[PDB]
Amino acid sequence: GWVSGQLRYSVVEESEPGTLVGNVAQDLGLKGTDLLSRRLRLGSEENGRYFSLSLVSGALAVSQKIDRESLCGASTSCLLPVQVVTEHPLELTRVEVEILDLNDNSPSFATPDREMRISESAAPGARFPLDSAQDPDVGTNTVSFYTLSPNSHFSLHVKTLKDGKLFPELVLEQQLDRETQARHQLVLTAVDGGTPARSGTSLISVIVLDVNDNAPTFQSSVLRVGLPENTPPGTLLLRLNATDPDEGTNGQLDYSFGDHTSETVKNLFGLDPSSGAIHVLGPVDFEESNFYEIHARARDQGQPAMEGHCVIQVDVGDAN
Ligand SMILES: *[C@@H]1O[C@H](CO[C@@H]2O[C@@H](C)[C@@H](O)[C@@H](O)[C@@H]2O)[C@@H](O[C@@H]2O[C@H](CO)[C@@H](O)[C@H](O)[C@H]2NC(C)=O)[C@H](O)[C@H]1NC(C)=O
Ligand SMILES: *[C@H]1O[C@H](CO)[C@@H](O)[C@H](O)[C@@H]1O
Ligand SMILES: *[C@H]1O[C@H](CO)[C@@H](O)[C@H](O)[C@@H]1O
Ligand SMILES: [Ca+2]
Ligand SMILES: [Ca+2]
Ligand SMILES: [Ca+2]
Ligand SMILES: [Ca+2]
Ligand SMILES: [Ca+2]
Ligand SMILES: [Ca+2]
Ligand SMILES: [Ca+2]
């Protein structure tokens, strides 16, 4: 039997030439040399392009391997119309051959890898758009879902439109930290709903840009040293070493005294802003003061500039 009004057959994508599509002669109620006597033929050479109608067997068969996505593309139903012509008397039957889709085509991305720059200060809940894959197959044989590589910081949300199209996007849950790791590498994978499933990948290399979120810190919180009375000027007391983990200018430092630092201390001690070398500039004396406290600070060359602090305790010795 056929569909009310028209004749219809089914054939599979990429099937080898010679495959039986359907017996036109029998289904059209003909037997014997009627076929040859009636000049049973396909309507045009476009019908005989993808098909052959034998005058002997009366069988409509595949004459050429048919790639459905080259004929219908993104069409759900692929009905290929052919015109079976018979003469004596002349009649025309319009037969429609549906090309059933095969899951022979794999999901693909435009680019094998993607590079994303994301600020360290990226707040949780931040959605970042991703490349969408393509699967020329139709139905469930096209892209079904996306999977992201297991990681600590990124989840995957896929917006599913009414039509069924998928849109993958990264959702940030745990705040990135460049000082921990600056590059996160994930693999976005697109999988179609066929069995067995076919896949495509896109290598997303997230780059964490530096934010000045770290103040400089000294190797020791408090430093207690000694300095003999009447120690000759030009003497190197010590060298300060503070370090900042941030990159570039955000990691470069400048050494200085505290704002509140006494003028007496400034007169006695000098401090190199670049190296962190604390020299004694003026002659110190025990009978003037017993103990000095130098508030040292190291400031970032970033915006805004941050600063760490260290207390240098100077015990002066007694002589006479
Ligand atoms: C002593 O200081 C060195 C140098 O620190 C660098 O110079 C500072 C002025 C500031 O710009 C820092 O951010 C610099 O790192 C420290 O050695 C560095 O250690 C880091 C640690 O990862 C390393 O990346 C650098 O290459 C090192 N630089 C050199 C020249 O060795 C060192 O850690 C400090 N020591 C102490 C005990 O704090
Ligand atoms: C393609 O291959 C991936 C692994 O790379 C599978 O996870 C997927 O189901 C498809 O078979
Ligand atoms: C996605 O990842 C796969 C390996 O998982 C690669 O073969 C592909 O080229 C793409 O980078
Ligand atoms: Ca195909
Ligand atoms: Ca196909
Ligand atoms: Ca597919
Ligand atoms: Ca950080
Ligand atoms: Ca940082
Ligand atoms: Ca910093
Ligand atoms: Ca003295």
Side-chain angles (χ1 to χ4, degrees), residues 1-9 23-30 91-95:
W2 0 324
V3 177
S4 63
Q6 302 161 1
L7 181 46
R8 290 199 188 274
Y9 298 139
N23 197 303
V24 174
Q26 177 194 352
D27 289 332
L28 200 39
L30 304 184
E91 305 173 3
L92 272 69
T93 310
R94 207 151 298 106
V95 186

PDB file of all heavy atoms in Angstrom, residues 1-9 23-30 91-96, unseen atoms left out:
ATOM      1  N   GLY A   1       0.802  -1.209   0.000  1.00  0.00           N
ATOM      2  CA  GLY A   1       0.000   0.000   0.000  1.00  0.00           C
ATOM      3  C   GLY A   1       0.839   1.264   0.000  1.00  0.00           C
ATOM      4  O   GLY A   1       2.040   1.222   0.278  1.00  0.00           O
ATOM      5  N   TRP A   2       0.206   2.391  -0.319  1.00  0.00           N
ATOM      6  CA  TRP A   2       0.900   3.674  -0.346  1.00  0.00           C
ATOM      7  C   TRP A   2       0.150   4.716   0.489  1.00  0.00           C
ATOM      8  O   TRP A   2      -0.859   4.414   1.123  1.00  0.00           O
ATOM      9  CB  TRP A   2       1.093   4.208  -1.782  1.00  0.00           C
ATOM     10  CG  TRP A   2       0.566   3.380  -2.956  1.00  0.00           C
ATOM     11  CD1 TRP A   2       0.543   2.015  -3.081  1.00  0.00           C
ATOM     12  CD2 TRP A   2       0.025   3.895  -4.181  1.00  0.00           C
ATOM     13  NE1 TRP A   2       0.004   1.656  -4.291  1.00  0.00           N
ATOM     14  CE2 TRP A   2      -0.320   2.790  -4.987  1.00  0.00           C
ATOM     15  CE3 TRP A   2      -0.210   5.183  -4.670  1.00  0.00           C
ATOM     16  CZ2 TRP A   2      -0.885   2.937  -6.252  1.00  0.00           C
ATOM     17  CZ3 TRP A   2      -0.770   5.326  -5.927  1.00  0.00           C
ATOM     18  CH2 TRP A   2      -1.102   4.209  -6.703  1.00  0.00           C
ATOM     19  N   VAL A   3       0.654   5.946   0.471  1.00  0.00           N
ATOM     20  CA  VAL A   3       0.023   7.072   1.158  1.00  0.00           C
ATOM     21  C   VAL A   3      -1.139   7.611   0.324  1.00  0.00           C
ATOM     22  O   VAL A   3      -1.074   7.615  -0.903  1.00  0.00           O
ATOM     23  CB  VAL A   3       1.048   8.188   1.455  1.00  0.00           C
ATOM     24  CG1 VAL A   3       0.378   9.390   2.111  1.00  0.00           C
ATOM     25  CG2 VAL A   3       2.158   7.648   2.350  1.00  0.00           C
ATOM     26  N   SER A   4      -2.226   7.992   0.991  1.00  0.00           N
ATOM     27  CA  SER A   4      -3.427   8.480   0.310  1.00  0.00           C
ATOM     28  C   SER A   4      -3.106   9.520  -0.770  1.00  0.00           C
ATOM     29  O   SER A   4      -2.632  10.617  -0.477  1.00  0.00           O
ATOM     30  CB  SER A   4      -4.423   9.058   1.330  1.00  0.00           C
ATOM     31  OG  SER A   4      -3.896  10.193   2.007  1.00  0.00           O
ATOM     32  N   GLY A   5      -3.335   9.140  -2.024  1.00  0.00           N
ATOM     33  CA  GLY A   5      -3.095  10.018  -3.156  1.00  0.00           C
ATOM     34  C   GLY A   5      -1.791   9.823  -3.913  1.00  0.00           C
ATOM     35  O   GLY A   5      -1.769   9.908  -5.140  1.00  0.00           O
ATOM     36  N   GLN A   6      -0.691   9.634  -3.189  1.00  0.00           N
ATOM     37  CA  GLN A   6       0.622   9.454  -3.822  1.00  0.00           C
ATOM     38  C   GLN A   6       1.297   8.098  -3.548  1.00  0.00           C
ATOM     39  O   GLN A   6       0.875   7.345  -2.673  1.00  0.00           O
ATOM     40  CB  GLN A   6       1.555  10.590  -3.387  1.00  0.00           C
ATOM     41  CG  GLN A   6       1.031  11.982  -3.729  1.00  0.00           C
ATOM     42  CD  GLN A   6       1.704  13.065  -2.904  1.00  0.00           C
ATOM     43  OE1 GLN A   6       2.582  12.778  -2.090  1.00  0.00           O
ATOM     44  NE2 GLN A   6       1.292  14.312  -3.104  1.00  0.00           N
ATOM     45  N   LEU A   7       2.360   7.798  -4.292  1.00  0.00           N
ATOM     46  CA  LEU A   7       3.162   6.602  -4.034  1.00  0.00           C
ATOM     47  C   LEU A   7       4.426   6.995  -3.273  1.00  0.00           C
ATOM     48  O   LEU A   7       5.017   8.033  -3.558  1.00  0.00           O
ATOM     49  CB  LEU A   7       3.510   5.888  -5.339  1.00  0.00           C
ATOM     50  CG  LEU A   7       4.320   4.591  -5.268  1.00  0.00           C
ATOM     51  CD1 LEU A   7       3.772   3.650  -4.207  1.00  0.00           C
ATOM     52  CD2 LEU A   7       4.327   3.902  -6.624  1.00  0.00           C
ATOM     53  N   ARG A   8       4.855   6.167  -2.324  1.00  0.00           N
ATOM     54  CA  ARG A   8       6.009   6.505  -1.486  1.00  0.00           C
ATOM     55  C   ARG A   8       6.889   5.302  -1.149  1.00  0.00           C
ATOM     56  O   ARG A   8       6.393   4.237  -0.776  1.00  0.00           O
ATOM     57  CB  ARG A   8       5.556   7.186  -0.188  1.00  0.00           C
ATOM     58  CG  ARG A   8       4.999   8.588  -0.390  1.00  0.00           C
ATOM     59  CD  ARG A   8       4.983   9.396   0.895  1.00  0.00           C
ATOM     60  NE  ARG A   8       4.282  10.664   0.710  1.00  0.00           N
ATOM     61  CZ  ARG A   8       4.848  11.775   0.246  1.00  0.00           C
ATOM     62  NH1 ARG A   8       6.133  11.782  -0.080  1.00  0.00           N
ATOM     63  NH2 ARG A   8       4.127  12.879   0.110  1.00  0.00           N
ATOM     64  N   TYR A   9       8.202   5.492  -1.273  1.00  0.00           N
ATOM     65  CA  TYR A   9       9.181   4.463  -0.936  1.00  0.00           C
ATOM     66  C   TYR A   9      10.217   5.010   0.041  1.00  0.00           C
ATOM     67  O   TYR A   9      10.317   6.219   0.230  1.00  0.00           O
ATOM     68  CB  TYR A   9       9.881   3.943  -2.193  1.00  0.00           C
ATOM     69  CG  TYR A   9       8.965   3.277  -3.195  1.00  0.00           C
ATOM     70  CD1 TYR A   9       9.122   3.495  -4.559  1.00  0.00           C
ATOM     71  CD2 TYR A   9       7.948   2.429  -2.780  1.00  0.00           C
ATOM     72  CE1 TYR A   9       8.290   2.890  -5.479  1.00  0.00           C
ATOM     73  CE2 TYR A   9       7.111   1.817  -3.694  1.00  0.00           C
ATOM     74  CZ  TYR A   9       7.287   2.051  -5.043  1.00  0.00           C
ATOM     75  OH  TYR A   9       6.457   1.446  -5.958  1.00  0.00           O
ATOM     76  N   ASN A  23       9.618  -1.965  -5.783  1.00  0.00           N
ATOM     77  CA  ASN A  23       9.105  -2.484  -7.042  1.00  0.00           C
ATOM     78  C   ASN A  23       7.975  -1.613  -7.566  1.00  0.00           C
ATOM     79  O   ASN A  23       6.842  -1.701  -7.095  1.00  0.00           O
ATOM     80  CB  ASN A  23       8.622  -3.926  -6.884  1.00  0.00           C
ATOM     81  CG  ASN A  23       8.458  -4.636  -8.219  1.00  0.00           C
ATOM     82  OD1 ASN A  23       7.727  -4.177  -9.098  1.00  0.00           O
ATOM     83  ND2 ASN A  23       9.148  -5.760  -8.378  1.00  0.00           N
ATOM     84  N   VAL A  24       8.290  -0.771  -8.543  1.00  0.00           N
ATOM     85  CA  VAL A  24       7.296   0.125  -9.105  1.00  0.00           C
ATOM     86  C   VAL A  24       6.262  -0.673  -9.885  1.00  0.00           C
ATOM     87  O   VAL A  24       5.062  -0.477  -9.711  1.00  0.00           O
ATOM     88  CB  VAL A  24       7.940   1.182 -10.023  1.00  0.00           C
ATOM     89  CG1 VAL A  24       6.870   2.014 -10.716  1.00  0.00           C
ATOM     90  CG2 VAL A  24       8.873   2.074  -9.224  1.00  0.00           C
ATOM     91  N   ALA A  25       6.736  -1.602 -10.711  1.00  0.00           N
ATOM     92  CA  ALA A  25       5.865  -2.389 -11.579  1.00  0.00           C
ATOM     93  C   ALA A  25       4.749  -3.103 -10.819  1.00  0.00           C
ATOM     94  O   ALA A  25       3.577  -2.992 -11.181  1.00  0.00           O
ATOM     95  CB  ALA A  25       6.688  -3.401 -12.365  1.00  0.00           C
ATOM     96  N   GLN A  26       5.107  -3.832  -9.767  1.00  0.00           N
ATOM     97  CA  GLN A  26       4.110  -4.561  -8.992  1.00  0.00           C
ATOM     98  C   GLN A  26       3.165  -3.631  -8.239  1.00  0.00           C
ATOM     99  O   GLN A  26       1.948  -3.825  -8.244  1.00  0.00           O
ATOM    100  CB  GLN A  26       4.786  -5.504  -8.003  1.00  0.00           C
ATOM    101  CG  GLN A  26       3.803  -6.244  -7.117  1.00  0.00           C
ATOM    102  CD  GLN A  26       4.472  -6.902  -5.934  1.00  0.00           C
ATOM    103  OE1 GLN A  26       5.699  -6.933  -5.837  1.00  0.00           O
ATOM    104  NE2 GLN A  26       3.667  -7.431  -5.020  1.00  0.00           N
ATOM    105  N   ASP A  27       3.735  -2.616  -7.598  1.00  0.00           N
ATOM    106  CA  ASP A  27       2.962  -1.679  -6.788  1.00  0.00           C
ATOM    107  C   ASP A  27       2.073  -0.786  -7.660  1.00  0.00           C
ATOM    108  O   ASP A  27       1.107  -0.194  -7.177  1.00  0.00           O
ATOM    109  CB  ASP A  27       3.896  -0.833  -5.921  1.00  0.00           C
ATOM    110  CG  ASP A  27       4.532  -1.632  -4.788  1.00  0.00           C
ATOM    111  OD1 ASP A  27       3.920  -2.622  -4.333  1.00  0.00           O
ATOM    112  OD2 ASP A  27       5.646  -1.267  -4.350  1.00  0.00           O
ATOM    113  N   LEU A  28       2.407  -0.699  -8.946  1.00  0.00           N
ATOM    114  CA  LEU A  28       1.615   0.067  -9.907  1.00  0.00           C
ATOM    115  C   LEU A  28       0.684  -0.865 -10.693  1.00  0.00           C
ATOM    116  O   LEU A  28      -0.008  -0.439 -11.614  1.00  0.00           O
ATOM    117  CB  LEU A  28       2.532   0.853 -10.854  1.00  0.00           C
ATOM    118  CG  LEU A  28       1.984   2.053 -11.637  1.00  0.00           C
ATOM    119  CD1 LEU A  28       1.018   2.869 -10.792  1.00  0.00           C
ATOM    120  CD2 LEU A  28       3.130   2.931 -12.131  1.00  0.00           C
ATOM    121  N   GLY A  29       0.671  -2.139 -10.308  1.00  0.00           N
ATOM    122  CA  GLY A  29      -0.195  -3.135 -10.921  1.00  0.00           C
ATOM    123  C   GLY A  29       0.098  -3.448 -12.379  1.00  0.00           C
ATOM    124  O   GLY A  29      -0.773  -3.315 -13.237  1.00  0.00           O
ATOM    125  N   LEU A  30       1.326  -3.870 -12.665  1.00  0.00           N
ATOM    126  CA  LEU A  30       1.729  -4.245 -14.021  1.00  0.00           C
ATOM    127  C   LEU A  30       2.455  -5.589 -14.004  1.00  0.00           C
ATOM    128  O   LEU A  30       3.083  -5.950 -13.011  1.00  0.00           O
ATOM    129  CB  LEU A  30       2.616  -3.155 -14.638  1.00  0.00           C
ATOM    130  CG  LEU A  30       2.121  -1.706 -14.737  1.00  0.00           C
ATOM    131  CD1 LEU A  30       3.138  -0.833 -15.461  1.00  0.00           C
ATOM    132  CD2 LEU A  30       0.774  -1.633 -15.458  1.00  0.00           C
ATOM    133  N   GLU A  91       0.272   7.884 -18.910  1.00  0.00           N
ATOM    134  CA  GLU A  91      -0.041   8.257 -17.544  1.00  0.00           C
ATOM    135  C   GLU A  91       1.241   8.533 -16.780  1.00  0.00           C
ATOM    136  O   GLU A  91       2.296   7.951 -17.065  1.00  0.00           O
ATOM    137  CB  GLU A  91      -0.825   7.146 -16.843  1.00  0.00           C
ATOM    138  CG  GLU A  91      -2.096   6.716 -17.553  1.00  0.00           C
ATOM    139  CD  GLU A  91      -2.729   5.501 -16.915  1.00  0.00           C
ATOM    140  OE1 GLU A  91      -2.202   5.028 -15.887  1.00  0.00           O
ATOM    141  OE2 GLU A  91      -3.753   5.019 -17.443  1.00  0.00           O
ATOM    142  N   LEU A  92       1.140   9.430 -15.807  1.00  0.00           N
ATOM    143  CA  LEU A  92       2.286   9.812 -15.000  1.00  0.00           C
ATOM    144  C   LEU A  92       2.010   9.586 -13.518  1.00  0.00           C
ATOM    145  O   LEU A  92       1.018  10.085 -12.983  1.00  0.00           O
ATOM    146  CB  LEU A  92       2.656  11.278 -15.243  1.00  0.00           C
ATOM    147  CG  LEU A  92       3.628  11.642 -16.373  1.00  0.00           C
ATOM    148  CD1 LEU A  92       3.032  11.402 -17.763  1.00  0.00           C
ATOM    149  CD2 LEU A  92       4.113  13.080 -16.222  1.00  0.00           C
ATOM    150  N   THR A  93       2.884   8.836 -12.858  1.00  0.00           N
ATOM    151  CA  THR A  93       2.747   8.610 -11.427  1.00  0.00           C
ATOM    152  C   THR A  93       3.888   9.321 -10.718  1.00  0.00           C
ATOM    153  O   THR A  93       5.051   9.148 -11.078  1.00  0.00           O
ATOM    154  CB  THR A  93       2.769   7.110 -11.077  1.00  0.00           C
ATOM    155  OG1 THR A  93       1.835   6.410 -11.908  1.00  0.00           O
ATOM    156  CG2 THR A  93       2.408   6.888  -9.609  1.00  0.00           C
ATOM    157  N   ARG A  94       3.560  10.109  -9.702  1.00  0.00           N
ATOM    158  CA  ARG A  94       4.589  10.820  -8.958  1.00  0.00           C
ATOM    159  C   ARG A  94       4.930  10.041  -7.698  1.00  0.00           C
ATOM    160  O   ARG A  94       4.134   9.969  -6.761  1.00  0.00           O
ATOM    161  CB  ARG A  94       4.135  12.243  -8.625  1.00  0.00           C
ATOM    162  CG  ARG A  94       5.280  13.230  -8.453  1.00  0.00           C
ATOM    163  CD  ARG A  94       4.869  14.648  -8.833  1.00  0.00           C
ATOM    164  NE  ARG A  94       4.477  14.754 -10.238  1.00  0.00           N
ATOM    165  CZ  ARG A  94       3.220  14.876 -10.660  1.00  0.00           C
ATOM    166  NH1 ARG A  94       2.226  14.915  -9.784  1.00  0.00           N
ATOM    167  NH2 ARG A  94       2.956  14.965 -11.957  1.00  0.00           N
ATOM    168  N   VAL A  95       6.121   9.455  -7.688  1.00  0.00           N
ATOM    169  CA  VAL A  95       6.577   8.663  -6.555  1.00  0.00           C
ATOM    170  C   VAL A  95       7.545   9.480  -5.714  1.00  0.00           C
ATOM    171  O   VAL A  95       8.383  10.198  -6.250  1.00  0.00           O
ATOM    172  CB  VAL A  95       7.258   7.361  -7.016  1.00  0.00           C
ATOM    173  CG1 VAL A  95       7.592   6.479  -5.822  1.00  0.00           C
ATOM    174  CG2 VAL A  95       6.364   6.616  -7.993  1.00  0.00           C
ATOM    175  N   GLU A  96       7.422   9.380  -4.397  1.00  0.00           N
ATOM    176  CA  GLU A  96       8.313  10.100  -3.505  1.00  0.00           C
ATOM    177  C   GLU A  96       9.148   9.129  -2.679  1.00  0.00           C
ATOM    178  O   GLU A  96       8.617   8.306  -1.932  1.00  0.00           O
ATOM    179  CB  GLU A  96       7.519  11.031  -2.589  1.00  0.00           C
TER     180      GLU A  96
END
